[PDB]
Design an enzyme around this catalytic site. Structure first.
Site, short mmCIF file in Angstrom:
data_model
loop_
_atom_site.label_atom_id
_atom_site.label_comp_id
_atom_site.label_asym_id
_atom_site.label_seq_id
_atom_site.Cartn_x
_atom_site.Cartn_y
_atom_site.Cartn_z
N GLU A 42 -4.59 -26.55 27.09
CA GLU A 42 -3.31 -27.19 27.35
C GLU A 42 -3.18 -28.56 26.64
OE1 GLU A 42 -1.77 -24.06 29.10
OE2 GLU A 42 -0.70 -25.74 30.01
N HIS A 81 -2.64 -30.09 35.46
CA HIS A 81 -3.15 -30.79 34.28
C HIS A 81 -3.73 -32.12 34.76
CE1 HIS A 81 -0.03 -28.22 32.17
NE2 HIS A 81 -1.11 -27.99 31.44
N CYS A 99 4.21 -36.54 30.28
CA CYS A 99 4.35 -35.15 29.83
C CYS A 99 5.17 -35.09 28.56
CB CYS A 99 5.03 -34.30 30.90
SG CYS A 99 3.95 -33.70 32.22
#
Ligand code: K
Ligand code: K
Lengths: 429, 429
Positions: free
Chosen positions: A162, A236, A353
């Site tokens: 990721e 995350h 993000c």
């Protein structure tokens, strides 16, 4: 000397929800993101931008068995299997924190800046990103003598990656060799792993990226995320912890062997300082709802730092209270800055993000495509572009509209000219 | 007049174990496979062959971060992360039942033969196959006026596809429009799915392949595998059931809604006959250990059928007993044929796993690359090739040997000439 440059994702035209809201505002989503970009730029923090992707993404629909022209395929899917429309029309690429993993030239064996695209294999709609994300990075970091872009790892659960969202870099000045910390959720043979929310990042993936990015073996540490925090919504590392220079702002329940990890960083990072938020003060739940840790920890020239947070942190008495306490405590954080990012937050994305941190030397900064660096001209150009092509209202049902498709194609073609990226999208080839 | 032609996989040089045996016999593995191929060909059943792949597969090791020359990469992996050697040196491509899904021209909307490569996303070592498998199929079924090869579905768990191993075709004569039965292990939204052994096949994938293969909507049925049988070792439908013409030989615990499925087949397939093996006679455990259902159900010209089984079925008193009873019962099966396939069975592959069924008209048969059709000349040529390059003994430790790498490259280059495939492998490009 090197500076950390933030590259933010410009929200795409198909931004939508697939809260109880079904109606999204693509235009406002983009403007909110642009405002954050501009504000930071104006305040003196190096800022740049990364464009949205081709959406709806017809090529994958063809891969799924629907044939004909772009419009016929769209029609066939709308009529036969409309649920695919949403999956191939997500504006998820806006969260560039997941676009790739970065290795500043100060940490590489060949002295170049390395960027490895993340496969984002766990989620189908995000796994579609890699190919186009690679093209974009190569068009932005085009000088091969300064930048090296590596393709994403194989698309399999074993190598789920990721990107930067699970990456960290600690050290003195940005330009000096730093300590890289890769956080993963699972590893083969290790029975310790999430049991409610599968781990999107595997240690095998993290180690391969470390390899691809030519990271000095002594400047890397792999740590496992606390499995209990993942089952609570921390998909995350950037939702439970964030690093910057010598500081690591994290929750006490962030890492599996936290005590050991911090001690290790103290031994390897000069002046390292860990700011742990005890659960008593702020729970994991509060962390997930406010996105306290999905904030950007920035550095000023005097060494002081600023915390960029989403509006939810100010609206939460408990978290806001903690932050004001942190502000007065003995640490580098001297300012708090809040931004309204409701559109992105509605889909699970906070300030961090939406950004990808890239430490670049003065010469490397010069080598980057100048057309993507933030300034008044680009800011005004992008705002105008958004006002021209973005809708104020959108629902999953509008994804079948051939006109939305056509608007998006023209928009991206014009943007590729504005950002001087050339024929970077599949439809342009 | 269409005939069903079996395409078998020629075992590769790196065949190995990664039971407790650690020493494999690549040469014997290949010869056992060739023997089965030849015997069926001699008995009158159309037979052809599909070559092994490039192993070790260095390109994926580079994708994992190991750089240098093929030999250096090999050396670095052997020293640093030797476990990858095995994962990139599997002879798994031999099980061509998983290579792709076939749609005879009698079932297609455009009248052509369609073949869709399976992504085999569930297992990393098998997911590496798709690209090369596509090149091989395009070199064998090269006439585009007769054959249409489609690339594998996106590599994500949502679209896990294991190919023909989960496919079935029922009907009168092979050349007539048949009823296609796609078996899957899981589907989104359906809480009914394996809980010990993840389902490699999703309904979403099956439906996409049906679309890609231009299958007439009225000639397709999607059925879910019984989840309890999957948790017992049935990872593919071809381990619990097999079809041929109007017959469906299956275990009573094979399908989720078996009663309804069979009744539906009876209503749609003329003369349809279901031969269900009750658990009382043969348990699922027995099924998995003997591979009773991974047998090939062949047709002779008079309409009679023959069951091709692995040695394990004859060595199991209970299963052998049932087979003898089946042979005397009122059904088309008039002969039992057993083959020694210990090498392949050691890794989980029976007679059916090693073959891919392709129904072809006389004109289509003529259009297939003649160099891969079985006959005395090809048989003798392949046996000699095997004797020249295959080792009698091999272990995972030998996968790091640069000489094994070089032997395999020359072998594949020579085989590509023998099978008239051209530069079909990555190393040749
Ligand atoms: K402070
Ligand atoms: K019989």
């Amino acid at each position: 000397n090197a500076w950390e440059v933030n590259f933010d994702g410009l929200v795409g035209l198909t931004h939508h929800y697939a809260h109880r809201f079904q109606v999204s505002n693509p235009r406002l989503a983009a403007k909110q993101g642009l405002l954050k970009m501009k504000a930071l730029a104006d305040a003196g923090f190096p800022q740049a931008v990364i464009p949205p992707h081709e959406r709806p993404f017809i090529p994958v629909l063809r891969q799924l068995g629907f044939s004909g022209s772009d419009e016929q395929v769209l029609e066939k899917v709308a009529r036969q299997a409309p649920h695919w429309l949403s999956s191939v029309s997500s504006a998820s690429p806006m969260w560039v924190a997941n676009a790739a993993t970065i290795a500043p030239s100060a940490d590489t064996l060949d002295g170049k800046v390395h960027l490895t695209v993340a496969n984002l294999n766990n989620k189908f709609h995000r796994s579609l990103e890699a190919p186009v994300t690679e093209s974009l990075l190569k068009a932005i970091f085009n000088d091969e003598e300064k930048f090296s872009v590596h393709s994403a790892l194989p698309q399999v659960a074993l190598l789920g990656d990721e990107g930067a969202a699970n990456h960290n870099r600690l050290g003195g000045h940005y330009g000096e060799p730093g300590m890289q910390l890769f956080v993963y959720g699972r590893e083969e043979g290790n029975d310790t792993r999430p049991s409610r929310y599968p781990a999107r990042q595997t240690r095998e993936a993290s180690e391969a990226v470390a390899r691809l990015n030519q990271v000095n073996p002594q400047q890397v540490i792999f740590a496992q995320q606390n499995p209990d925090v993942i089952d609570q919504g921390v998909f995350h590392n950037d939702v439970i912890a964030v690093s910057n220079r010598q500081v690591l702002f994290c929750h006490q329940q962030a890492f599996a062997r936290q005590s050991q990890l911090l001690a290790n960083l103290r031994a390897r990072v000069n002046g390292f300082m860990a700011i742990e938020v005890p659960a008593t003060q702020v729970s994991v739940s509060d962390t997930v709802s406010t996105y306290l840790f999905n904030s950007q920890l920035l550095s000023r020239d005097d060494g002081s730092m600023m915390l960029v947070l989403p509006q939810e942190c100010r609206e939460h008495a408990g978290v806001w209270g903690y932050l004001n306490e942190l502000l007065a405590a003995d640490n580098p954080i001297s300012e708090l800055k809040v931004f309204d990012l409701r559109e992105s937050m509605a889909n699970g994305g906070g300030p961090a993000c939406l950004r990808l941190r890239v430490v670049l030397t003065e010469e490397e900064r010069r080598a980057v495509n100048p057309a993507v660096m933030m300034n008044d001209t680009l800011f005004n150009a992008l705002n105008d572009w958004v006002d021209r092509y973005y809708r104020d209202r959108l629902t999953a049902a509008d994804l079948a509209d051939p006109q939305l498709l056509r608007e998006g194609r023209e928009a991206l073609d014009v943007l590729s000219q504005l950002l001087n990226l050339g024929s970077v999208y599949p439809f342009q080839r």
